[PDB]
Coordinates of C-alpha atoms in Angstrom, one line a residue:
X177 CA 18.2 -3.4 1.2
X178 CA 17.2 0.3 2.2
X179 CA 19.4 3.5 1.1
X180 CA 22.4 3.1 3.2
X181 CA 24.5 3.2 0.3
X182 CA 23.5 6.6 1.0
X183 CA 26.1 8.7 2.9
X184 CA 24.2 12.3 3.7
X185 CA 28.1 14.0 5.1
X186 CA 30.7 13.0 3.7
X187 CA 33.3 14.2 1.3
X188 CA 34.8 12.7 -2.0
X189 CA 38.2 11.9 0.7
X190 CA 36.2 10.6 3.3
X191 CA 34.4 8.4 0.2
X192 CA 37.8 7.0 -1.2
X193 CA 39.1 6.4 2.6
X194 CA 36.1 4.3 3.3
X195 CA 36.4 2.3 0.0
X196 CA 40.0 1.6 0.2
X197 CA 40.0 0.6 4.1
X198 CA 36.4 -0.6 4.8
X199 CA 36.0 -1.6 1.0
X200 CA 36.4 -4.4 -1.3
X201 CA 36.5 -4.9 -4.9
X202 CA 32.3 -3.9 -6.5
X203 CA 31.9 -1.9 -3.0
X204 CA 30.3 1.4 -4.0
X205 CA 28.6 4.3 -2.1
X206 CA 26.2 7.4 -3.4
X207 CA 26.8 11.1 -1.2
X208 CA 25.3 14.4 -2.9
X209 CA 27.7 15.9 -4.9
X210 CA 26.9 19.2 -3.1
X211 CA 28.7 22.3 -5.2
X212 CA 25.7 22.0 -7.3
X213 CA 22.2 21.9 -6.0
X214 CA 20.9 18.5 -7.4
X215 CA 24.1 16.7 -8.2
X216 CA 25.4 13.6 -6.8
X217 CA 28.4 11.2 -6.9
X218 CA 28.5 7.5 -7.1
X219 CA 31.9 6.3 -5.9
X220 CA 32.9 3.0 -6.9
X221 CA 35.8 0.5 -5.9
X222 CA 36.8 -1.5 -8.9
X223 CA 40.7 -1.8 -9.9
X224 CA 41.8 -1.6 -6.1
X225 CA 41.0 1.9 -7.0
X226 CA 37.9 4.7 -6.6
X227 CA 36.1 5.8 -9.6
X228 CA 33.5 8.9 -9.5
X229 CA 30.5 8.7 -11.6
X230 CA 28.4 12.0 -11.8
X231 CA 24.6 11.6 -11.5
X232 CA 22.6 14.6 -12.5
X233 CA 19.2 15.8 -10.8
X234 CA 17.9 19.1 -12.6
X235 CA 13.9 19.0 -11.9
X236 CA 12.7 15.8 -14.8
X237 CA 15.2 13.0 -14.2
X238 CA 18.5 11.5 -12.4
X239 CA 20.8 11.0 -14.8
X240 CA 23.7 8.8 -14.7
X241 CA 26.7 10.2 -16.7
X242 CA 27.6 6.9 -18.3
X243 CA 24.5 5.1 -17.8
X244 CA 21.0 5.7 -18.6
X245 CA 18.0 8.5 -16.9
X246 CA 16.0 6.8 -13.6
X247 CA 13.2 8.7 -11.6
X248 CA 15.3 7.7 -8.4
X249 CA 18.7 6.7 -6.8
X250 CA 17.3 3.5 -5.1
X251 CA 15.9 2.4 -8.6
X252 CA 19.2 3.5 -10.2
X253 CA 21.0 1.0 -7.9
X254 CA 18.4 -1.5 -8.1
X255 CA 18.5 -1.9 -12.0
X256 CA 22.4 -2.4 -11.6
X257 CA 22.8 -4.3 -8.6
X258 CA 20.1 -6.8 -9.8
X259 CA 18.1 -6.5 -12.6
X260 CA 19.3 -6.0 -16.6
X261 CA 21.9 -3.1 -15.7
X262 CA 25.3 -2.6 -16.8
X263 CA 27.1 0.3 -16.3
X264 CA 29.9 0.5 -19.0
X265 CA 33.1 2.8 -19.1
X266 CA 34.9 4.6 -21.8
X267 CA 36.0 1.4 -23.0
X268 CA 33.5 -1.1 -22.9
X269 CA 33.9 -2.9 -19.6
X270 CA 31.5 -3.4 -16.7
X271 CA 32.2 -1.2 -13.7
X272 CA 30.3 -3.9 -11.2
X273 CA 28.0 -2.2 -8.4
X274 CA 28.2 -5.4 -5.7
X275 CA 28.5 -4.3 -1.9
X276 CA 26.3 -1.5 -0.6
X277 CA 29.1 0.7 1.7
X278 CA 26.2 1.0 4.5
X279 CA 26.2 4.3 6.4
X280 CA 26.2 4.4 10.2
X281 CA 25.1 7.9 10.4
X282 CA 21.1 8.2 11.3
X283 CA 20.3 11.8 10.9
X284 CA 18.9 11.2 7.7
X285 CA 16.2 9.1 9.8
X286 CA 12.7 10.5 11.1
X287 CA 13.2 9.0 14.3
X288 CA 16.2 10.6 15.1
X289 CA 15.8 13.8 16.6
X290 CA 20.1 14.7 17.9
X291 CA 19.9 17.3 20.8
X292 CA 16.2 17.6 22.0
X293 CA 14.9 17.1 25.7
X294 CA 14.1 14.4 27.8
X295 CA 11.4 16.4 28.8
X296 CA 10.7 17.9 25.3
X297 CA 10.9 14.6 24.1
X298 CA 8.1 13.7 26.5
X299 CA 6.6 17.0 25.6
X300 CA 6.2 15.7 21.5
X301 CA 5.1 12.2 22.6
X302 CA 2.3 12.8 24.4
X303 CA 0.8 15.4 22.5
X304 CA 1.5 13.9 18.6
X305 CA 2.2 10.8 19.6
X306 CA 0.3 7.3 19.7
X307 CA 0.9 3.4 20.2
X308 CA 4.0 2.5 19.0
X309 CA 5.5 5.9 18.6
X310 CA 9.0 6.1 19.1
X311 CA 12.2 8.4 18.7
X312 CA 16.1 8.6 19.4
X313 CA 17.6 11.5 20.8
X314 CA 21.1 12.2 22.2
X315 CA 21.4 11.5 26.1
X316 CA 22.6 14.2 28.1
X317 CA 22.9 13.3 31.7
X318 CA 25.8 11.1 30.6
X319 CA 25.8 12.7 27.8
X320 CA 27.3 10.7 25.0
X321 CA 24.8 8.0 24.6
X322 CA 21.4 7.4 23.3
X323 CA 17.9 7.4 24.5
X324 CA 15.6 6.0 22.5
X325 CA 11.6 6.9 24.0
X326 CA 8.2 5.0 23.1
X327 CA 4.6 5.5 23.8
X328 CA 2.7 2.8 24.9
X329 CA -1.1 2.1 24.8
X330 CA -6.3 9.4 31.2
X331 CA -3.5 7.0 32.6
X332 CA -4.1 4.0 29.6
X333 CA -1.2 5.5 28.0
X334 CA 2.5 5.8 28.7
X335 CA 6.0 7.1 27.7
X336 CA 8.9 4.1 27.9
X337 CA 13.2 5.2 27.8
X338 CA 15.6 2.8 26.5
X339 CA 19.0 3.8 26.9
X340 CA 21.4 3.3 24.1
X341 CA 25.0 2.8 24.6
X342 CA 27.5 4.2 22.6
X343 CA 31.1 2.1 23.4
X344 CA 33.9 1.0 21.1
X345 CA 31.6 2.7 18.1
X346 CA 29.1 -0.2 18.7
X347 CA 25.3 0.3 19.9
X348 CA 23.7 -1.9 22.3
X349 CA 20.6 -1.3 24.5
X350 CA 22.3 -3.1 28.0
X351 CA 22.3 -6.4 26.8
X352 CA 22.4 -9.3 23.8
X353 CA 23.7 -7.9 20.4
X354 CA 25.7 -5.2 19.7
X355 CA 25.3 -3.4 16.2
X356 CA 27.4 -1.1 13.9
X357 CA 24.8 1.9 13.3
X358 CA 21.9 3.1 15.0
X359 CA 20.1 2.1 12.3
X360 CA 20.9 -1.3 12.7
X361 CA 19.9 -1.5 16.2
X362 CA 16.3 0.4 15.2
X363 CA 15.4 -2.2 12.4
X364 CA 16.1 -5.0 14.9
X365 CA 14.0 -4.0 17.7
X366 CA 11.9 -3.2 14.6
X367 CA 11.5 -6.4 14.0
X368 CA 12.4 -8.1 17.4
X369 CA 10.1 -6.2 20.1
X370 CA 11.6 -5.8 23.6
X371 CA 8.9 -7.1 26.3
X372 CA 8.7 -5.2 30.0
X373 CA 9.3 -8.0 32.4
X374 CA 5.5 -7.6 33.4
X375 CA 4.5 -8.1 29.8
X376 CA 4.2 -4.8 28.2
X377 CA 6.2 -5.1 24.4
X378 CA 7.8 -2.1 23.2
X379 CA 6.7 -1.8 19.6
X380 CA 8.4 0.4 17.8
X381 CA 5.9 1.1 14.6
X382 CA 6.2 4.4 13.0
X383 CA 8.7 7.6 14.2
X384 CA 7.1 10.1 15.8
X385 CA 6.7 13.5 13.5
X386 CA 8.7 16.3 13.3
X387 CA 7.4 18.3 10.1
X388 CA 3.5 18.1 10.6
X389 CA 2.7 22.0 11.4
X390 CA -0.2 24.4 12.0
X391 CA -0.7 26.3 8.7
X392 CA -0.8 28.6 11.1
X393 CA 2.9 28.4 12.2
X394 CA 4.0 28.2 9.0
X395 CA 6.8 31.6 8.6
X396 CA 7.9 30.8 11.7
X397 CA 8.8 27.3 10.2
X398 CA 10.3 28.5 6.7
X399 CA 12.6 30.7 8.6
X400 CA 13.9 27.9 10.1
X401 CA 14.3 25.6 7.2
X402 CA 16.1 28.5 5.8
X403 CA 18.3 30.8 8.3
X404 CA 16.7 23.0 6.6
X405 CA 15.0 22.5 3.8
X406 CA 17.9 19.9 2.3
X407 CA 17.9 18.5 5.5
X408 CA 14.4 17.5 6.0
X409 CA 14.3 16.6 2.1
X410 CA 17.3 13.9 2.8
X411 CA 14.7 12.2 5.6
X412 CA 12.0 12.0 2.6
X413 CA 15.0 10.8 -0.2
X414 CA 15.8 8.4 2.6
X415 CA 11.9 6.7 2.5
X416 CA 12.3 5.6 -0.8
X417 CA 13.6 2.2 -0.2
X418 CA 9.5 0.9 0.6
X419 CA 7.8 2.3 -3.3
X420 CA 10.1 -0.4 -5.5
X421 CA 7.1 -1.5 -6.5
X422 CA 7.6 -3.3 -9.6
X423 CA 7.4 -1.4 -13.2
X424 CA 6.8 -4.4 -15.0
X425 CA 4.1 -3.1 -18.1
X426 CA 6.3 -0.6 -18.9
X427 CA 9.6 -2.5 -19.2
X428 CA 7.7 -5.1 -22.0
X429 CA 9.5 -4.8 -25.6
X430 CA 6.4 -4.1 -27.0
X431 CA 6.2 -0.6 -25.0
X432 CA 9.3 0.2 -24.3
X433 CA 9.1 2.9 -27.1
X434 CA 6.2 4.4 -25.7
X435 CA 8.0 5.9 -22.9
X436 CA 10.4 8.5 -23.1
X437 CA 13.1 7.3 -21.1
X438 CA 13.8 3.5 -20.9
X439 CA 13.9 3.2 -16.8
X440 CA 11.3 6.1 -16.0
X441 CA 8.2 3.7 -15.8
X442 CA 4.5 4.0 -14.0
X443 CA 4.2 1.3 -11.7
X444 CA 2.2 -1.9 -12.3
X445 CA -0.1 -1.4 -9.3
X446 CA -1.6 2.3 -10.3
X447 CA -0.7 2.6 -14.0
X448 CA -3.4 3.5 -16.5
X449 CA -4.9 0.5 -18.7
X450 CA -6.2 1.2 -21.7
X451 CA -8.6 -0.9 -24.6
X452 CA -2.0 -1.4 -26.6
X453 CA -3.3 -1.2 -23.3
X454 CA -0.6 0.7 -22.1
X455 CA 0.8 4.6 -21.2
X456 CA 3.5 6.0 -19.1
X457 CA 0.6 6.8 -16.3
X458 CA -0.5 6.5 -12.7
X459 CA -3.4 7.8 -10.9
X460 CA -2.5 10.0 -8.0
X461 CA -5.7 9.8 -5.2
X462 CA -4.5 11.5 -2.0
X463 CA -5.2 9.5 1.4
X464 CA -4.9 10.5 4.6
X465 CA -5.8 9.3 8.1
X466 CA -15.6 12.8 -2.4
X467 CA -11.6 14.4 -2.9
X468 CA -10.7 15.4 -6.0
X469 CA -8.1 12.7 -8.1
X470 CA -4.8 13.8 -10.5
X471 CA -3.2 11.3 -13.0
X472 CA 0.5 12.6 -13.5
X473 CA 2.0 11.7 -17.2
X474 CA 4.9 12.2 -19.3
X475 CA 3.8 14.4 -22.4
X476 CA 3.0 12.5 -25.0
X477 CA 5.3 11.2 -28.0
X478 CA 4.8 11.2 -31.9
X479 CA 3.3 7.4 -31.0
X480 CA 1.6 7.9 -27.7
X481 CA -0.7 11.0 -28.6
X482 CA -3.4 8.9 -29.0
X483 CA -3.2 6.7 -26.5
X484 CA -2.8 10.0 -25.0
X485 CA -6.4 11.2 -26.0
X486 CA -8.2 7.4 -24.9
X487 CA -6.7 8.6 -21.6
X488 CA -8.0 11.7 -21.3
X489 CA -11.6 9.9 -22.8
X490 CA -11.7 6.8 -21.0
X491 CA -11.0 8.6 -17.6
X492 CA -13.6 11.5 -18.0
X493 CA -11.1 13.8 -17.0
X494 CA -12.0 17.0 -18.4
X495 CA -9.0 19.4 -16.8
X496 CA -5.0 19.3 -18.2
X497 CA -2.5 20.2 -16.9
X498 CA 0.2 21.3 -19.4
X499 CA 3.1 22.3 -16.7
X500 CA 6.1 23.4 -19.7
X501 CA 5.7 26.3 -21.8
X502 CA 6.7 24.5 -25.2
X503 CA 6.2 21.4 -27.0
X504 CA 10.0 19.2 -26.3
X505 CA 13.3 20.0 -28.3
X506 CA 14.3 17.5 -31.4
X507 CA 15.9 15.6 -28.2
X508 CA 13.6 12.6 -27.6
X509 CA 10.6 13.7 -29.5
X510 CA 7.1 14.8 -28.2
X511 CA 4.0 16.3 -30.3
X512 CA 1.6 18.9 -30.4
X513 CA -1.3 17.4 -28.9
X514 CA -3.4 20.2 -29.8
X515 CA -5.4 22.0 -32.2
X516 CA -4.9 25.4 -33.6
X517 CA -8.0 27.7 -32.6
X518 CA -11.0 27.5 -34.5
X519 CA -9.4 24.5 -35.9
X520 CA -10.4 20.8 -35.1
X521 CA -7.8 17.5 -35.3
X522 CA -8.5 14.0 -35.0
X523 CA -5.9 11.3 -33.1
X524 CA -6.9 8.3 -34.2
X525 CA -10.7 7.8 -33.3
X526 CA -10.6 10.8 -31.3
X527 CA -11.7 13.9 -32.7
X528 CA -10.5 17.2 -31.1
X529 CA -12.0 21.3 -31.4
X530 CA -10.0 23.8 -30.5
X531 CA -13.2 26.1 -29.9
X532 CA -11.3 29.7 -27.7
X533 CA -8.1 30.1 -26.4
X534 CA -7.6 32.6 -23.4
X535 CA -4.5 34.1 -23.1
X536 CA -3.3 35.2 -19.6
X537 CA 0.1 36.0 -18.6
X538 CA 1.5 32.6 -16.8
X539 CA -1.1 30.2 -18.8
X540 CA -3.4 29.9 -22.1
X541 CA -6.6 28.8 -21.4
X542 CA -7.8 26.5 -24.3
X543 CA -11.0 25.4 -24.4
X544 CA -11.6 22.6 -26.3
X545 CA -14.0 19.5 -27.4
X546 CA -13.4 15.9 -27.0
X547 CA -15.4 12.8 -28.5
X548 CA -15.4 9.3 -30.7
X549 CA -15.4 9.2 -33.9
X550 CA -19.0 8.4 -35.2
X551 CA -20.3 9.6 -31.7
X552 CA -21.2 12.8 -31.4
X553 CA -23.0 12.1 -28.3
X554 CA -19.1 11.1 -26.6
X555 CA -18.7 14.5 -27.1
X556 CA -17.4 17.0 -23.6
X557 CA -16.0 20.0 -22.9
X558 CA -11.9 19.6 -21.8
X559 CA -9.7 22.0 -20.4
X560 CA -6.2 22.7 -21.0
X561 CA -4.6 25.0 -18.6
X562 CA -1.0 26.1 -20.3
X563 CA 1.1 26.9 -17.7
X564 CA 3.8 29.1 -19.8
X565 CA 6.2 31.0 -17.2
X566 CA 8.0 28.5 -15.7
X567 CA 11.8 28.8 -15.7
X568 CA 14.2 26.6 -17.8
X569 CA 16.4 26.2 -15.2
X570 CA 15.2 25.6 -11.2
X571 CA 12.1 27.1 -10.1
X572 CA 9.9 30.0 -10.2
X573 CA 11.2 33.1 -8.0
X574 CA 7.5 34.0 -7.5
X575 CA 5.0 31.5 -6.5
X576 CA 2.1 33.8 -7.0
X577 CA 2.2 33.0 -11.1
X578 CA 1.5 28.9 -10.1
X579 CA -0.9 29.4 -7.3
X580 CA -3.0 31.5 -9.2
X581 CA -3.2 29.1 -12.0
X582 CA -3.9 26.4 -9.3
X583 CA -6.7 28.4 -7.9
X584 CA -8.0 28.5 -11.6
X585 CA -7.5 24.9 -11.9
X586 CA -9.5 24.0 -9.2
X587 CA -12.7 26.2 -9.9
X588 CA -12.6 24.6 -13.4
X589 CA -12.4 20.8 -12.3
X590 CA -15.2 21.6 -9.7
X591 CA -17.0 23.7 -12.0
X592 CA -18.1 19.7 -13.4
X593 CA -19.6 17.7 -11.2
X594 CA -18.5 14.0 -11.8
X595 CA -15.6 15.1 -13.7
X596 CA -13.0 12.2 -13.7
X597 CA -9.1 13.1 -12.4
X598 CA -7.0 16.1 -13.4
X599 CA -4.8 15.2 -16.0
X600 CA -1.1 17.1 -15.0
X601 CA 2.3 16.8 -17.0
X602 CA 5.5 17.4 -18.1
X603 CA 8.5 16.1 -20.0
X604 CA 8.8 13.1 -17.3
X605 CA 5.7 13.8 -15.5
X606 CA 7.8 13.2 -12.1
X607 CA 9.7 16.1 -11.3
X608 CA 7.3 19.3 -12.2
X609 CA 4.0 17.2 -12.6
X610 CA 4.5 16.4 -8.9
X611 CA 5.5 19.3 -7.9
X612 CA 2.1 21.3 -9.3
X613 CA 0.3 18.1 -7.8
X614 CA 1.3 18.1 -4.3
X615 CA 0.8 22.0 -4.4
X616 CA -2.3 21.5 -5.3
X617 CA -3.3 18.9 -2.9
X618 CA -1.5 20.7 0.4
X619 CA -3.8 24.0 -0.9
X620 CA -6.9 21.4 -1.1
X621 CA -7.0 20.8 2.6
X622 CA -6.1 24.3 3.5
X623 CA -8.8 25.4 1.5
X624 CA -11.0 22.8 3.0
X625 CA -9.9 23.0 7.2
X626 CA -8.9 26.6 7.3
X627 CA -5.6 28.2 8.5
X628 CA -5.8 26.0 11.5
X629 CA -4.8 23.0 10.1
X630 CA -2.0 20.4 10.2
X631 CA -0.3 19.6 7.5
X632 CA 2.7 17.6 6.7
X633 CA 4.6 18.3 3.2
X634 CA 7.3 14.9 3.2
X635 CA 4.3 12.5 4.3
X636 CA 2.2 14.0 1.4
X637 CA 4.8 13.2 -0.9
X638 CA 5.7 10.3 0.3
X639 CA 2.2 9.4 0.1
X640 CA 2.6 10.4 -3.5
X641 CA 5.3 8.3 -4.5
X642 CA 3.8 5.2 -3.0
X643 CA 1.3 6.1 -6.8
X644 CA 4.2 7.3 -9.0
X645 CA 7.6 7.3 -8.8
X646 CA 10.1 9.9 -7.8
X647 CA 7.3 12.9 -7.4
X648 CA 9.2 15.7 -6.4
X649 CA 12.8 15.8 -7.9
X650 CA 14.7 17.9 -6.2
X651 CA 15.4 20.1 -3.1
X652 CA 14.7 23.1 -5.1
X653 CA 10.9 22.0 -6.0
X654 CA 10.7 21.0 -1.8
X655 CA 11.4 24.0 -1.0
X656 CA 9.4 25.8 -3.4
X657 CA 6.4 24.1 -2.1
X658 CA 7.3 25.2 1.3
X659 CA 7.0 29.1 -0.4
X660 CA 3.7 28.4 -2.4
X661 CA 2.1 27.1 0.4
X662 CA 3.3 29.8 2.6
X663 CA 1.8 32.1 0.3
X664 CA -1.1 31.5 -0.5
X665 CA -1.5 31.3 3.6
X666 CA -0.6 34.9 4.2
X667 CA -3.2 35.8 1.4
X668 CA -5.5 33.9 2.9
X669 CA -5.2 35.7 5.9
X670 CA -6.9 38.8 4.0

């Protein structure tokens, strides 16, 4: 299993090299495409040759050029490595997807940190750090090799260093097996703890972080993701491998029309049920280690805009989020889920007033009134924030317009008391939706603990995903959280 199919560095010659030498026949690799922010290649070895198969991340989907539109790369090759999946060339034939072309490079991983101190290393553990805490830096009083540190357990404590030999382009820790990446040798001890000779075991449980910061600190951490930001957003694509949770619902021929895109499905375990019990939904609750709840959605179809309103009803959420500026192209549908002002609709049992609409510059504002049929005591107040000014292409050059709009959000939603989660969407309701969401959470908890707080935008996400998947499509939406967040601190500051 895992994402090392994924290669982070290499180039389409380095790809064909490794195919045809370290590659059979249904081998295959993924590498970002680079050149274009958001493109990626699959490489394939079929005929004794290499074939190159473009996949396409602008902010909604992945697309497979070829295939069909997943919400991300590990359940891209899932769906064709096992599952129903087929991908078919010009012709007809299969182009088989057998032998994962694993990666040795590690850099991609959160515990490994390159060129960093033994003492520095020392210097994060003890202060961030707790019982099974680990890392693996580069060794430089050989140099060459590896050092991989834990913490164990004032005085209870302690800081343990494994040295990790690099010989022949195999790793080994001074004895028993030898393995072919880093990787490989972390996931075994992993799995198989060392023990100290006096008893202590060396669990390695979680890698130590590198991209919780002080909201304080936080320009004098953009700078440095710019002068990265792709490069801390690899670490994150690289989690992905533990959220194939299974989509099953979704994938039933009975609702497969009620989702926009075939593959693009809400997971069993958080998906909304209704009572025909079913809508491309999850709740989003944000845990850490009384808040305030999101459900992220696609937006709705000619046949779901019902469903859509039961939702909305049966949830008592009484806050949307409407993240695209217009109602979809003729390409794959989508409705008006609202009325006209002054006017009043009815979707299915659910009746609908359109009773003011606000106009602002980013947003409209409409206010409007949701109940049964035949129940006129159902009835309560819903808001739709309209968020109109973001860009067709990438992300907003200003992240004033969607704080703004966030602050606005929040004031409504906790404006009710007992109002049930904030309803955000867009065309997939992965890409935008969770960008606006984790926004909106990160801003949240800096409202909440002041400037002086740590905060940690991959494990939020990640955190995310775990409830829906692919939240957060690209680098571009990464790193324009990293500049709405760092706004709305240097406004707070005022």
């Amino acid at each position: 299993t895992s994402r090392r199919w994924f290669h982070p560095n290499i180039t389409g010659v380095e790809a064909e090299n490794l195919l045809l030498t370290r590659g059979v026949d249904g081998s295959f690799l993924a590498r970002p495409s680079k050149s274009n922010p958001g493109d990626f290649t699959l490489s394939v070895r079929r005929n004794g040759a290499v074939t190159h198969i473009k996949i396409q991340n602008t902010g909604d989907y992945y697309d497979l050029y070829g295939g069909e539109k997943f919400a991300t790369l590990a359940e891209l090759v899932q769906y064709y490595m096992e599952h129903h999946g087929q991908l078919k060339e010009k012709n007809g034939d299969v182009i088989e997807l057998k032998y994962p072309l694993n990666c040795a490079d590690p850099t991609s991983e959160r515990w490994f940190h390159g060129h960093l101190s033994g003492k520095e290393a020392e210097k994060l553990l003890t202060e961030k750090g707790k019982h099974g805490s680990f890392l693996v830096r580069e060794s430089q009083s050989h140099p060459g090799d590896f050092v991989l540190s834990v913490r164990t357990g004032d005085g209870k404590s302690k800081v343990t260093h494994v040295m990790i030999r690099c010989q022949e382009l195999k790793y080994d820790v001074g004895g028993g097996e030898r393995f072919d990446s880093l990787t490989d040798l972390v996931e075994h001890y992993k799995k198989n703890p060392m023990v100290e000779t006096l008893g202590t075991v060396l669990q390695l449980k979680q890698p130590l972080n590198t991209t919780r910061i002080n909201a304080a600190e936080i320009e004098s951490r953009v700078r440095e993701l710019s002068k990265g930001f792709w490069e801390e957003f690899e670490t994150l694509q690289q989690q992905e491998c533990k959220l194939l949770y299974s989509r099953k619902e979704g994938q039933r021929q009975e609702n497969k029309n009620k989702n926009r895109y075939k593959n693009i499905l809400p997971f069993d375990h958080t998906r909304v049920v209704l009572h025909s019990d079913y809508i491309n939904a999850n709740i989003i609750m944000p845990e850490f280690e009384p808040k305030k709840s999101y459900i992220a959605t696609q937006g709705c179809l000619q046949n779901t805009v019902n469903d859509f309103w039961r939702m909305v009803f049966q949830e008592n959420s009484r806050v949307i989020v409407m993240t695209t500026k217009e109602v979809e192209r003729g390409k794959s549908k989508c409705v008006k889920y609202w009325p006209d002002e002054y006017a009043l609709k009815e979707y299915g049992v659910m009746r609908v007033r359109n009773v003011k609409e606000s106009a602002a510059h980013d947003y409209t504002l409409r206010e409007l009134k949701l109940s049964k049929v035949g129940q006129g005591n159902t009835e309560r107040t819903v808001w739709q924030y309209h968020f109109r000014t973001w860009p067709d292409h990438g992300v907003p050059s200003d992240p004033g317009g969607v704080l703004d709009f966030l602050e606005e959000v929040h004031h409504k939603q906790e404006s009710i008391m007992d109002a049930g989660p904030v309803v955000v969407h867009c065309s997939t309701g992965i890409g935008r939706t969770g960008t606006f969401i984790v926004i909106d959470i990160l801003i949240d908890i800096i409202r909440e603990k002041g400037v002086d707080c740590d905060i940690d935008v991959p494990k939020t996400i990640q955190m995310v995903r775990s409830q829906r998947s692919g939240m957060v499509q690209t680098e571009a939406q990464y790193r324009f959280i990293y500049m709405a967040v760092q706004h709305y601190i240097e406004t707070l500051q005022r």
